[PDB]
Amino acid sequence: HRIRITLTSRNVKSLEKVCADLIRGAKEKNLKVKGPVRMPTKTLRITTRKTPCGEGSKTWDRFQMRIHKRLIDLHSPSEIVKQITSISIEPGVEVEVTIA
Amino acid sequence: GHQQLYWSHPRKFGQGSRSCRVCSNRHGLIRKYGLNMCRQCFRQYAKDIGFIKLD
């Protein structure tokens, strides 16, 4: 089965920790695994004013929120993927599993 | 015909069909990314959402 695991979150260190955990689990389970594909980061910007009224010098805010995405490939049946993804998941990391 | 006189005006677009989801105001909305909030409430609640000032 050509199963794919997509890993996305806000922070980068928890995503890297859970991704390295998945890679080292697939390595210790004696199974071939492709490397993590580093997707380009999506940047979400809203530039809004600072004064609630219309008085003062025109000063703007620059809010920003970066989103990272990873791609993980395996060559195993479904129960191996569930038993490797159902143990020790980060609280801030969102995971989605897709199969073809 | 008071019931059908009450809604002879269809408000399906324009500034009056959209309101902030916090303070119910119809000025300075943020329609980006499906936020649908005014600028002041977005600045008030922008820390918990995830929008932080870096640049």
Binding site: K42, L44 | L35
Partner: peptide, 19 residues
């Protein structure tokens, strides 16, 4: 599902739900 909103909109809705 049949809606499947985008990855940016999902995180925005999660932040709105948290707020």
């Amino acid at each position: 599902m049949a809606v499947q909103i985008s990855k940016k909109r999902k995180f925005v809705a999660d932040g709105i739900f948290k707020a």
